Design a protein around this nucleic acid. Structure first.
Lengths: 183, 187, 191
DNA sequence: GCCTGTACAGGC
DNA sequence: GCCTGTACAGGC
């Protein structure tokens, strides 16, 4: 797979554990940080830190591929296929009409909080639909080539960190979801 | 692998997991949501008892079971319904069903009981998911469901030398093996 | 369907489409991007000549062809390389290749020429894609490419009673049939 | 890198 | 609604 938001799961929904995120369908892989098939596209990713060169500005963030040089295969190629431009594994690519691209469900996890004030203070939060604007190769903090992506928010649902996003969370009563018995 | 029949090495009867993804990663029941795993032209490998069909009856060592749709439509002996029927040591019959006189010679089914079965079974665990061992399909048959449409029904009977968790000896063995509820890492 | 061999009913030699999606919807060459359509244990149904390998030579009625993989790895007689070899009326041989004495008995390949082949062929159309008819694999062989790695090469030869678009009679027939560049619905109106 | 379906191999 | 690969059926 499903592209785009999950019905009944609005932006700002929160889960304590990744197993809950998986069961909800927002980000199916229990461990892996990106969900995609190389011959299709990418459906979801989790921002949980781990790459110091990534920048998180909320509506704009950069993302580093997985994965000794990296190849535009597996999930890296899948995320590229979301970009509204023909696939290119040499210089990368960029979409002028980036909004016509394939949607990516983005979840932020608390572990992204070291380098980003947009990360939730606890657990995992669904932050809405982002689009791949461009992607390119570069020599990262390991000497070898990494594939990097710029994603931009494209969602009428306001961001959880914005005024209208925080007001909607209070109106819907969306609180942190804990598994039965955990509390 | 996906089509493994029988017990998983290192996973005794009584093993407990909190979440379905753990049950899947262990190989005991691979589908995260579907209640049954099988291939329609091969057989069924595992099923999860989680409530749902009120006419199902669970007596631990054996239970009646209901197939799937895919109520507003007759069920069919296709897909996983057919897979489970193939386990019965009898020729497929999608008209009247069939019964294996030599039922132990049929294909094994790993059976997990889930906490949600507790509303309709005193054998469901109080939490999470529990592997209760190997069962065999004795017989299967169609009947008019509660809504007037056809459902496929199955009788499964336990064929496992590891004692059931509802027995004193099965509880004692589970304690000596040190089995505890397994949670995801860092939980 | 996907694995249809031979000409498409209602699609003569000389038919022209501006974009690859149109060529695909017609059944003539179904892959939008891949230059060859085939199943590795069956055969190849169609291919597109769009340039790309410098040592390929195109003489219209026949051409040399290179399979798929700067090359950094030997080619292999698998996937669509193997499918095209299977069209050759000879036992498959992945060591020296093979050659069919009775090459017309081989399986047919629908051949499309695309404008990008014009740099290396005077037979490419000036615009878009053109169906040029049925060809047969005469022979195929491995050789060292310019990179020094192995490439699989093929010789394809035309076996089609519809005259080639590069002949006077072929052009004249294309005119009488009224064939024109096919564009997507409302394409020129939007431009 | 046709498309929407379906199914198997193998994961552990 | 296990996963990610692969392959075929059939579109027109």
């Amino acid at each position: 797979n499903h592209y785009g938001p999950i019905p009944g799961i609005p932006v700002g929904t929160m889960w304590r554990f990744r197993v809950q995120v998986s069961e909800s369908g927002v980000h199916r892989p229990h461990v892996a940080g990106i969900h995609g098939r190389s011959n299709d596209g990418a459906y979801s990713l989790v921002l949980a830190g781990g790459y110091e060169d990534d920048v998180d500005h909320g509506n704009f963030f950069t993302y580093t591929g997985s994965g000794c040089d990296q190849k535009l295969t597996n999930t890296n190629r899948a995320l590229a296929l979301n970009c509204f431009a023909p696939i290119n594994d040499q210089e990368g690519a960029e979409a002028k009409d980036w909004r016509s691209g394939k949607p990516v469900r983005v979840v932020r996890n608390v572990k992204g909080g070291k380098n980003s004030k947009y990360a939730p203070a606890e657990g995992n939060r669904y932050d809405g639909i982002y689009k791949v604007v461009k992607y390119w190769p570069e020599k990262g903090k390991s000497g070898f080539l990494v594939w990097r992506y710029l994603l931009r928010r494209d969602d009428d649902e306001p961001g959880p960190w914005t005024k209208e996003g925080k007001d909607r969370i209070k109106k819907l009563g969306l609180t942190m979801q804990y598994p039965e018995g955990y509390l």
